[PDB]
Amino acid sequence: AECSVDIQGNDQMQFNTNAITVDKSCKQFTVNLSHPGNLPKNVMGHNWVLSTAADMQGVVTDGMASGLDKDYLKPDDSRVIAHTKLIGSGEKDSVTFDVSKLKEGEQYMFFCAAAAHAAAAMKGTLTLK
Ligand SMILES: [Cu+2]
């Protein structure tokens, strides 16, 4: 069972993956986010956020309004299954979540909630396999 993934968000507003697989034998799954490049948090800060496909737009919109000092997420947002903090270059963060939080049939999306980043396609799918 492969129960973690290392993902990078760079100074050019991209993740180095578009698709995450979660082994369904995993009890927990861990995302390790890092930020190659030179740009600080306030310029090109990234996070990793998990929601259902349907909820992503809302999470992003409300997170935009919540703003930078809230790490671009509505605090305690019920739609956020898991999330890292916002990180700048040189910084890192991990998040671990229960795999039981994912449903059969459902469609899940990961993304950066930082202003404009998801629109520029800092997103992809997350799928139970
Ligand atoms: Cu970002």
Side-chain angles (χ1 to χ4, degrees):
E2 296 171 48
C3 297
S4 58
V5 60
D6 303 352
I7 188 169
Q8 292 171 16
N10 66 16
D11 286 349
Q12 292 78 44
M13 209 180 281
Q14 68 224 152
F15 280 133
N16 67 342
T17 188
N18 300 332
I20 298 166
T21 298
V22 182
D23 250 287
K24 43 218 212 193
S25 66
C26 294
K27 252 43 166 80
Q28 285 174 143
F29 193 80
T30 301
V31 178
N32 296 308
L33 179 70
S34 66
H35 189 323
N38 315 132
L39 295 184
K41 177 157 83 182
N42 62 313
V43 177
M44 193 60 70
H46 302 305
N47 53 25
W48 188 89
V49 188
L50 185 58
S51 86
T52 68
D55 275 332
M56 160 170 180
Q57 177 170 35
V59 174
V60 167
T61 296
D62 292 354
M64 186 200 57
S66 287
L68 177 59
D69 287 346
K70 287 289 189 166
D71 283 356
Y72 287 114
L73 285 170
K74 177 184 187 165
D76 305 311
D77 198 329
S78 277
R79 300 164 295 191
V80 179
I81 302 152
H83 68 96
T84 69
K85 75 184 165 174
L86 203 72
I87 67 165
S89 59
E91 294 182 317
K92 69 190 199 175
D93 198 30
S94 303
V95 61
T96 301
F97 63 92
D98 292 339
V99 171
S100 57
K101 291 199 174 310
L102 311 170
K103 265 199 188 83
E104 311 49 46
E106 187 64 271
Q107 212 57 223
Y108 300 93
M109 291 293 290
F110 71 89
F111 50 92
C112 183
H117 296 208
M122 289 203 67
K123 66 187 175 178
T125 58
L126 179 141
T127 313
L128 286 169
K129 285 187 196 191

